[PDB]
Amino acid sequence: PFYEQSIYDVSDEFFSLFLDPTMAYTCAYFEREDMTLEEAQNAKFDLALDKLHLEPGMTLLDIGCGWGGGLQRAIENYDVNVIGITLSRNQFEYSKAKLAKIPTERSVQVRLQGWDEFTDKVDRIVSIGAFEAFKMERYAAFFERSYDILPDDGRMLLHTILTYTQKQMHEMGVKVTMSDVRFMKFIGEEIGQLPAQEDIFKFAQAADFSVEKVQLLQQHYARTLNIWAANLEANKDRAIALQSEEIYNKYMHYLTGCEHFFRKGISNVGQFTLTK
Numbered sequence: 001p002f003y004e005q006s007i008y009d010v011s012d013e014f015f016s017l018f019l020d021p022t023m024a025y026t027c028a029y030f031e032r033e034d035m036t037l038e039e040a041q042n043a044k045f046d047l048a049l050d051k052l053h054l055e056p057g058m059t060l061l062d063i064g065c066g067w068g069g070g071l072q073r074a075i076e077n078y079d080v081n082v083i084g085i086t087l088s089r090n091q092f093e094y095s096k097a098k099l100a101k102i103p104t105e106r107s108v109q110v111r112l113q114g115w116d117e118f119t120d121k122v123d124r125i126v127s128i129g130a131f132e133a134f135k136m137e138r139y140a141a142f143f144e145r146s147y148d149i150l151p152d153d154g155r156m157l158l159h160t161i162l163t164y165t166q167k168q169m170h171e172m173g174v175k176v177t178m179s180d181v182r183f184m185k186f187i188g189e190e191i192g193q194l195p196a197q198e199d200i201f202k203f204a205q206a207a208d209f210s211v212e213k214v215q216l217l218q219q220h221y222a223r224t225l226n227i228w229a230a231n232l233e234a235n236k237d238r239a240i241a242l243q244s245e246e247i248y249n250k251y252m253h254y255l256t257g258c259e260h261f262f263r264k265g266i267s268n269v270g271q272f273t274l275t276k
């Protein structure tokens with residue numbers, strides 16, 4: 001009967017207190033065990049981009065380009081035109097300015113645009129950590145739009161957090177405690193729908209994609225979240241100064257709780273190679 005500060009309300013400066021310098025907010029890939037967080041984030045973008053079989057002169061679309069680290073690796077390591085789209089104004093301005101400083105002989109575009117608006121023809125698509133925000137009632141249209149803008153040899157790499165069914169968690173030996181259910185409720189009131197592995201298969205193969213590979217990075221995310229949490233704790237006083245002890249505690253709770261979910265087996269994260 002009235003109108004009444006969440007983790008969403010934090011500034012980009014707040015995220016720089018605990019993300020690596022490239023501002024990746026998605027699962028890293030510790031290709032070597034002694035990699036730093038930044039090296040492992042680079043390795044995760046490189047892992048994704050390598051699966052696209054990019055050739056010189058192709059155009060690459062990044063759906064949900066975040067703070068731009070994925071397209072930075074694409075511009076630096078491939079001779080391709082890139083288009084990045086995002087619906088975040090902060091990330092749009094950040095990525096446009098970050099990417100403008102990179103030498104290139106190709107075209108580079110960053111747009112404030114959603115996927116349901118995107119009509120350009122592109123040769124390859126990467127989408128890292130954008131799918132989690134889609135509603136399942138939008139899944140079909142997403143894969144259809146992606147399929148239609150690709151050519152006949154088109155490839156797409158979809159990277160997304162995944163959940164398990166109750167039966168799967170049963171068979172796997174994953175016993176969900178009350179603190180796990182308390183945490184899933186916490187995610188409701190502070191963070192709506194996550195796909196299972198089989199869902200990506202269903203909706204991608206319904207849109208005439210073929211699934212050629214799924215790669216699961218469960219324990220890489222546990223390590224990613226562990227490092228994020230250690231960084232934020234190192235920067236606690238600054239985090240509380242920018243925000244509040246309330247917000248610092250919520251973010252630490254959220255990072256360490258998510259870490260626990262990946263470590264114990266409740267959550268996973270997959271890269272899906274889709275071909276046309």
Ligand SMILES: CCNC(=N)NC(=O)Nc1c(CC)cccc1CC
Nearest residue numbers: 025026128129130132133254255258
């Ligand atoms: C939908 C857009 N978001 C992503 N794809 N991924 C994250 O939000 N990852 C993440 C998680 C998830 C386990 C927990 C704490 C903090 C972060 C990022 C800083």
Ligand SMILES: [Cl-]
Nearest residue numbers: 024025026066
């Ligand atoms: Cl990212």
Ligand SMILES: [Mg+2]
Nearest residue numbers: 064065066128
């Ligand atoms: Mg992304």
